[PDB]
Design a protein around this ligand. Structure first.
Ligand SMILES: CC(C)CCC[C@@H](C)[C@H]1CC[C@H]2[C@@H]3CC=C4C[C@@H](OC(=O)CCC(=O)O)CC[C@]4(C)[C@H]3CC[C@]12C
Ligand SMILES: CC(C)CCC[C@@H](C)[C@H]1CC[C@H]2[C@@H]3CC=C4C[C@@H](OC(=O)CCC(=O)O)CC[C@]4(C)[C@H]3CC[C@]12C
Lengths: 411, 411
């Protein structure tokens, strides 16, 4: 009874997803026929339909009798929502001030985007864990339309190389440099906001809808120092050669300690004798993006010449990142089902390390993008698609693993 | 206890899959660095490792005490195995006879391919439903290595445009034309053999490892006539203009009858009051390839000019194919949980229609490939990847739906 309408809402969602994916892919492949303005028209129609549905929800569905995690997904949702609203404000200011020889087309589509980020954030803040009871089949089609729009927006954010190559054409002055800097710096925030919204809307139509801290704090402070140094050097010019080595050597100092600590915690777990499935599949599927991008990096270094200074640091960094993802995944999946104090230090050290490793890969001009090594191997558009597919998924993995390791810490 | 080693075998499989996918994708993108011979070396090492494991299985694992669907997967497995052995024989004869100015490199890699298709078919014929009990963790790593090799072989078969554009370069004489004709005609057989093997190896490490017929026969005979007419015209020259219209008009006659019959069967189902989950996800995931390819076709026609003779037949054919997939899926998913005789006629008519619609899209020069409409819209390599991703999945859907509708027929 429920699963049948669930299937029908899924058919609506898959038809909208595959139609929009055909439009976006025709924008990638056959660029002369399908224009980005047509994709914006389709996504604007779809966004306005989601606006009418969530407005009808907030005004006339949430008032009849319905049925009678919660701290970090909501906070990251408001954070990434605020920064994506700011990103679209930066895009509007980039549209209106420098290039004044335009029509009124490229201002309306980010304005509906601003409105859509705003009221979806307000709607997902309050109405997340509330099992809808009055209008089942309308709510499932509405939520699946919203998920389809978020997936099409994420796909456009992944494969949209248009402004990112347009900005770097002029780079080959008073406020337009501020606007370009802010747009490039804030571009992963919308791409990860789409994934956060997809996760919480999926939850609310699937289930809903029927000593150690001292070293950890030292790691967080040194990570903040190298991150602010790389970001100050990065948004001032084409940054440097040595700051790459500094960032990657911070990675090669931190990540083997996390591998060794995760392996030790796994041995301690061997020395002692629905929600869990969604947590497992979220951890694995979020790990796959960074594992895939780093395997592309491994092949891209060993096919070219290794044994340069930082070029050996990217290789070792990628291999240690794979190994850290794997051992940390084994540690978390084993952890969800003199010893206890040691394991508490392990878990809180990994929590603080995951927080500083969460804040770092979401700020635009990342050093896995800003080398001429994977670029001019796969190419700009291909490596842009790989990086924007992988790095928001690594941010999602860091968030979800912060939650899992905080559950381990109070276990 | 079991799920942990299951996870570890999955880590081995995902590492091999992502490493080989990085090699194949570097062959697509950075063609100057990674050569197809290196992909053949990697797949040959991987194939030989699977050969040693399955030979050790057949000779020294299947003899200790183990634990104490079956008619069409096995038959299609032997059929596609025989035709892929024949395809690799055709590839060897294409390698050795026409282009004699070669080294001994391109003969060994199809020879290990022939041996690998042969003994995997022999191994999957007898040892499919036998729960292995003696060497658990070795068998899981072996089966996951074999699944990783089959997925990498399927990915190379999907994205391997190399010979298919090489053959059509000379087309711009005694036996090399026979060899090229047979290779192009038999190329989907290996690509669908890989998916059949992936499905049965996935089963044997997942669960194992711990009146109406008269019109249906008329449809089958007329489908055989239009298929043999298109194949005789197709492998004689660049075929015709009118045979496309004949094939697509057979589709536009047959598929609305299947939509109407599936909708009627759904209404009759509304008028009466593990394995199932794998069947559902196999039906949906096999449907997604044809639904995606036809949505690409819909966008490719409506972005260019419709309202030509057969160009309106491809559009209506694609929309009716989407609608037939959707209504037949609704019919099968409802069917798995004066009236009974009518529903029996519905099910057997759809069985015979699915058999003739199973034999048709697996024979090479397909009319969804052989128009200059989606080609020169997406391009040869892109549309080749789309067609070889979609059409073996449609063959898999037709097979799996023949099995499901035969279960419905005796229900
Ligand atoms: C990343 C983008 C570019 C592609 C992702 C596509 C998905 C967004 C679509 C395509 C297939 C769709 C699924 C197709 C089938 C179903 C099964 C359906 O489940 C049932 O069949 C319940 C009925 C029953 O169990 O009998 C639930 C919706 C769902 C997952 C759909 C949800 C949305 C999916 C995953
Ligand atoms: C088509 C190609 C290019 C990409 C396909 C990638 C897959 C071949 C890989 C990537 C993710 C891998 C999966 C990652 C995680 C797991 C979960 C694991 O299941 C468990 O976690 C059991 C333990 C538990 O339940 O607690 C089983 C292996 C599996 C499916 C792996 C099997 C192989 C997968 C699907």
């Amino acid at each position: 009874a429920q699963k049948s309408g669930q299937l029908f809402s899924g058919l609506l969602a898959l038809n909208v997803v595959f139609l929009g994916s055909a439009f976006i892919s025709s924008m990638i492949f056959n660029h002369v026929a399908i224009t980005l303005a047509d994709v914006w028209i389709l996504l604007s129609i779809l966004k306005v339909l989601c606006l009418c549905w969530i407005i009808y929800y907030l005004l006339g569905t949430s008032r009849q009798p319905h049925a009678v995690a919660p701290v970090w997904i909501r906070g990251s949702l408001l954070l990434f929502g605020t920064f994506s609203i700011l990103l679209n404000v930066f895009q509007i200011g980039y549209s209106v001030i420098q290039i004044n020889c335009k029509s009124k087309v490229e201002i309306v589509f980010p304005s509906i985007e601003i409105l859509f980020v705003a009221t979806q954030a307000f709607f997902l803040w309050h109405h997340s864990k509330d099992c809808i009871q009055v209008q089942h089949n309308l709510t499932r089609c509405g939520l699946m339309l919203t998920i389809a729009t978020n997936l099409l927006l994420w796909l456009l954010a992944v494969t949209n190389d248009s402004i990112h190559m347009e900005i770097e054409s002029q780079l080959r002055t008073t406020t337009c440099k501020v606007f370009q800097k802010g747009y490039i710096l804030l571009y992963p925030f919308n791409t990860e906001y789409c994934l956060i919204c997809c996760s919480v809307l999926y939850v609310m139509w699937k289930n809903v809808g029927r000593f150690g801290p001292l070293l950890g704090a030292a790691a967080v402070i040194i990570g903040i120092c190298v991150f602010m140094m790389y970001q100050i050097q990065a948004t001032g010019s084409a940054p440097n050669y040595q700051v790459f080595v500094l960032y990657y050597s911070y990675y090669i100092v931190l990540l083997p300690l996390m591998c060794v600590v995760a392996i030790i915690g796994t041995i301690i777990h061997t020395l002692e004798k629905p929600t869990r499935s969604l947590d497992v599949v979220l951890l694995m599927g979020a790990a796959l993006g960074q594992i895939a991008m780093s395997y592309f990096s491994i092949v891209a270094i060993v096919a070219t010449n290794p044994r340069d200074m930082l070029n050996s640091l990217i290789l070792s960094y990628s291999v240690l990142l794979i190994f850290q993802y794997i051992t940390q995944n084994i540690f978390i999946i084993d952890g969800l089902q003199w010893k206890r104090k040691a394991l508490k230090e392990i878990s809180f050290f990994l929590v603080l390390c995951n927080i500083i490793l969460w804040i770092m890969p979401t700020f635009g001009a990342h050093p896995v993008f800003e080398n001429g090594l994977q670029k001019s191997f796969y190419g700009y558009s291909t490596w842009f698609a790989i990086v924007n597919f992988g790095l928001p998924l690594s941010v999602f993995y860091r968030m979800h693993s912060v939650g899992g390791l905080l559950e381990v810490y109070v276990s």
